[PDB]
Every structure is written in structure tokens, then in C-alpha cells.
Ligand binder design. Structure first.
Ligand SMILES: Nc1ncnc2c1ncn2[C@@H]1O[C@H](COP(=O)(O)OP(=O)(O)OP(=O)(O)O)[C@@H](O)[C@H]1O
Ligand SMILES: Nc1ncnc2c1ncn2[C@@H]1O[C@H](COP(=O)(O)OP(=O)(O)OP(=O)(O)O)[C@@H](O)[C@H]1O
Ligand SMILES: C[C@@H]1O[C@@H]1P(=O)(O)O
Ligand SMILES: C[C@@H]1O[C@@H]1P(=O)(O)O
Lengths: 265, 265
């Protein structure tokens, strides 16, 4: 044993930090180039803005790539991994769209290029820039997304927005809550699986085999949960009030449906 | 005295690293929103691509903001320094345009958001991300630009592309050559001032008072020259061959006109 800070955890506890990920399905049609649903962005932004005020300096917003990200990956040449570099430009545009919208309603939203801040080493993302922590400490809202990241051999890899919360794990103090908003109510097994134990999540993986994206979400959120995070897969809706995401899980409204991924506590 | 590596320097010596800055005047009309001269970008890119091959892993390309940067600064609200955040999005677009063009002709060009990598402390830019060095070591071409940078108080400042070479100073080993391509042949005093000693450049500053942008260039290049760099202000032209920028200054073609800023050596 090495010593570390004992962190109180449980469904009774308020999160110290929110990582909110908004799936591309919710504001973009992959098979419509450059599509962004401005109404969806507008409405989500209003709900994200209220979270950001409470979680000032204690939140990130992570955007899915939508048409932009999936186009960049579709149009690259796999014989030259460097052609993936266009993905960094694609996912910058989506971050811009969120940040512009949020600033328009008074949120101090700043887009940050994950590729300028993070690289891969033995497959694990490494935060390599101090700027993310600074931005948070200034009380601003980082707008993040997936990206094309370099590995230690100079090879670019597509790193999904779904995995971005992994990057926060060494940086966040206290209780991290990760919320992945998608176009389904959770992991469907048909019923939702309401609880997954990240120590042994084999039944959640077995459910995706039943129903064939979601694998990547599960992988990322298990990884996060094994490092103490309280993670959720749940349905996004542009107009839905998200104030409950500030609250202890045991206090959530009864109508809310999700898959909750944790280790004991 | 503290010891340090003795670096051979002089007009007889080949540069170890090239920082090439392309002024917005050369490819963009400030007062035409979103203007980018695609032909100018195309032609410059072909000439930059030859430098990047020789200087593989030993060069950065820095873009002026043009219409994009100056629009963002024009349209921000000075009563809320955070509205400058749109400048980061503006100068990302210009980096994208260069990097797309360069990749199209086989250069491993990758845009990097300076704001994600650098902050200001007591007015001095601080490189805060290890990713720039990595990208270079991978043999890629960073595409840089000016940006909105945070200070230590959380205030955003417009940091010109002209100042970006300053950020390289602690990072570059060996002889850095900085080349600022603009729409004039150098500092006009009318004749060009061919040599400026960065230790006491008072006559170059006196010339700008004669002729009223250029002040910022001089400040940045003096700063760089005082830390060993060999710096140039010279006229850019999309079709002009730049191969001479790989060569010792004493070997440059006789037709080339510039203002050279150095300390002794
Ligand atoms: N067991 C499962 N339960 C729920 N969804 C599942 C399951 N297995 C696979 N999925 C699929 O995963 C999808 C969610 O992942 P997906 O990557 O499509 O969404 P997103 O990231 O929100 O948006 P985008 O479509 O732009 O990537 C669901 O729509 C569903 O089709
Ligand atoms: N003594 C001087 N010698 C030469 N140019 C000078 C002098 N004093 C002021 N200048 C001005 O500085 C200009 C170059 O700086 P400027 O910022 O306009 O160019 P740029 O960065 O290349 O492009 P952009 O116009 O988009 O910023 C010249 O066109 C000139 O008008
Ligand atoms: C990184 C690529 O845009 C996709 P995702 O982030 O939605 O998985
Ligand atoms: C940073 C603002 O775009 C301008 P410049 O980089 O051309 O000075």
C-alpha cells in the first residue's frame, strides 16, 4: 500500500466535477455533410449553460463529432494514417459551434483542441498540456471533442469523444460524474440495465452482442468507474432540464432512466 | 556565470530550425470577411512544402490572421475580454486552410491551437504543452497562428502571429532562423535598413515613427534575436522560390532584399 486521499463516495454524495458528453446523434445527421441542427444546439446550450453556472470551473462539455467527425474518418486514406489529420479540423468545427452558441448566452465557453493537449502512449491517452487545468481554474467552460491523436511512434489514431472523460481521470480531484447523452435510454438487455459494476461488467457487454458506438462508451465509462467516477449512459433531448445532474443520484427524479456504471460506492 | 552549450553562429552557418511566418496581407483582404486568396495559399504552399521536406521536424509555419483574425478582434466587446474567445476559432480556420492545402501536396501538416498550448505570465508567453515538441520529433509540420491566450488572471489577450516565434525560444536547440514574410521589403528608413542590432535597435524604431503591425514584428524579432535567433523581415510573394531560406545568409542570392535582425554573430 501507497497512501492516498480517502474520498467519500456514494449515491448520497454530490459530484465535484461534471463531464457531460453530447452525442452526435442528438444534433447532427452523420449522412448529411456539415449538418448541424442549430435548434438542437441552441436548446441544449441553454440547459448546459445552467449546469456550467453551478459547476463553474468544475465542468467540461464534450461534443460528439456528428457529420463532421464521421465525414473526416470516411474521407481519409487508411494507407496514410496522416490523412486522419483532417479529423482534428472537423472536430474543431463542432467545438466552435458549441462554444459560439454558449458564449451567445453568457457562458465563458472556450474550445480546446485535444490533439494539442494529449497524446497516446501504450494506447493510454496522456494529458500533456497544463492549459486545461488553467482554463478550469479561471472558471471557464472547456468545450472538448474527440480528435486525431499522435502516438509515441507518430501514428495518428481516431480518438472518440466517448473516451475523452478518460483524459480527466488524473486531473480531477474529488468525485467525477460522467454523463453520456445518447439516443437510447441506456444499455438495453428488452429492458434497460440500470446498474453495471465496473469491476465485473461482463453482462453489459453481453447485451451489446444481443443488440450490436455503444462498445466504445461502455469501455470508456468502465475505465472511468474503475478510477472512482460515477458514470451514466442516458437519453439526451434538447429541451430536457438537466438540473438533476447537479444532485446526488439518490435524489434524482423518478422519471429519469439511465445505465449507471460504478464500482462499490 | 552559469554554464551553457556554446552554439556556433554567424552568416556562414546553416540554420537548424526555420520559423516561417506568412503575413495575412499576402493571402487575405482584412476588409473582405472570410476572404482567403486560394491561389495565393496554393502557390505559397508549394514553396513552403519544399522547405518542410528539408527542414523535416525542424520547421513551423505560422499564419497571419487576415480577415479572420482581424474580424474576430473587430467584432468582440472590449467590456468583456472573454468575447475575444472567438479569435481562437478565427485563427483555427486559417490554420486549417494552410494545413489542408499542404496535406494535399504531400506535407504532413498539422494545425495546433496555440491557446491550448500556451498562456501568458507577467506578459511573457509560456509553452505549457509538450505536444509541439512531439509533433516536430515525429517529423510533422506544425501549422501555427496567433490566438487569444489566457493570462494568469484569466484575462484573454490577442497574441499576434508575429509573436509566435517567441514561444519557440526555450524549445529550439541550435540556430533558429525566423522569417517574417510581409508586403514590404523590410524596415524602410526611403531605403531599407539592411541590418538591425537587437542589442540597441533604436534606429529601426525611429524608422517606423517616420512611416507609422511593423512595431509588433520588430518587438518580436528583437526579442528572438536577443536570444540568439537570426531574424528577417522581407517581402512575400506566392510564387517566389524560398530555397535560399535553407542556406547560410552569406550565400543568399544577390537580388534578395530584407531587414536582418541579430546580435553580434
Ligand atoms: N445494448 C445496447 N443498448 C443500447 N444501445 C445500443 C446497444 N448496443 C448497441 N447500441 C447502439 O448504440 C447507439 C448509441 O451509440 P452512437 O455512437 O450511435 O450514438 P452517439 O455517440 O450518441 O451519436 P453518433 O451517432 O454521432 O456517434 C444506440 O443508438 C444503439 O443503436
Ligand atoms: N518603417 C517601416 N518599414 C516598412 N513597413 C512599415 C514601416 N512602418 C510601418 N510599416 C507598415 O507595416 C506593414 C507590415 O505590417 P502588416 O501587419 O500590415 O502586414 P502583415 O502582418 O504582413 O499582414 P496583415 O495586414 O494581415 O496583418 C507595411 O505594409 C507598412 O505599411
Ligand atoms: C472522433 C470522431 O468524431 C467521432 P465521435 O467523437 O462522435 O466518436
Ligand atoms: C492574432 C490576430 O490575427 C491577427 P495577426 O496574427 O495577423 O496579427
Amino acid at each position: 500500500h501507497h497512501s492516498s486521499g480517502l474520498v467519500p463516495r456514494g449515491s448520497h454524495m454530490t459530484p465535484d466535477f461534471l463531464a457531460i458528453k453530447v452525442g452526435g446523434s442528438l444534433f447532427s445527421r452523420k449522412d448529411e455533410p456539415g449538418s448541424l441542427d442549430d435548434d438542437a444546439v441552441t436548446r441544449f446550450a441553454r440547459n448546459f449553460a445552467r449546469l456550467a453556472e453551478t459547476y463553474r470551473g468544475r465542468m467540461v462539455l464534450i461534443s460528439g463529432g456528428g457529420a463532421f467527425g464521421h465525414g473526416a474518418i470516411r474521407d481519409h486514406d487508411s494507407t496514410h494514417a496522416f490523412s486522419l489529420a483532417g479529423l482534428t479540423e472537423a472536430t474543431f468545427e463542432v467545438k466552435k459551434r458549441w462554444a459560439e452558441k454558449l458564449r451567445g448566452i453568457g457562458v465563458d465557453a472556450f474550445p480546446l483542441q485535444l490533439a494539442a493537449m494529449c497524446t497516446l502512449r501504450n494506447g493510454i491517452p496522456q494529458l500533456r498540456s497544463e492549459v486545461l487545468r488553467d482554463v478550469l481554474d479561471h472558471g471557464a467552460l472547456p468545450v472538448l471533442a474527440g480528435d486525431a491523436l499522435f502516438d509515441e511512434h507518430g501514428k495518428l489514431w481516431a480518438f472518440s469523444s466517448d473516451r475523452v472523460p478518460e483524459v480527466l481521470l488524473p486531473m480531477v480531484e474529488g468525485r467525477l460524474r460522467v454523463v453520456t447523452l445518447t439516443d437510447v435510454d441506456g444499455i438495453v438487455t428488452d429492458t434497460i440495465l440500470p446498474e453495471v459494476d465496473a469491476r465485473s461488467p461482463e453482462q453489459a457487454y453481453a447485451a451489446l452482442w444481443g443488440s450490436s458506438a455503444m462498445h466504445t462508451k461502455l469501455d470508456a465509462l468502465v475505465t472511468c468507474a474503475r478510477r472512482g467516477a460515477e458514470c451514466f449512459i442516458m437519453r439526451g433531448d434538447p429541451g430536457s432540464d438537466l438540473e438533476f445532474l447537479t444532485a446526488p443520484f439518490s435524489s434524482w427524479p423518478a422519471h429519469v432512466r439511465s445505465t449507471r456504471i460504478t464500482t462499490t460506492a
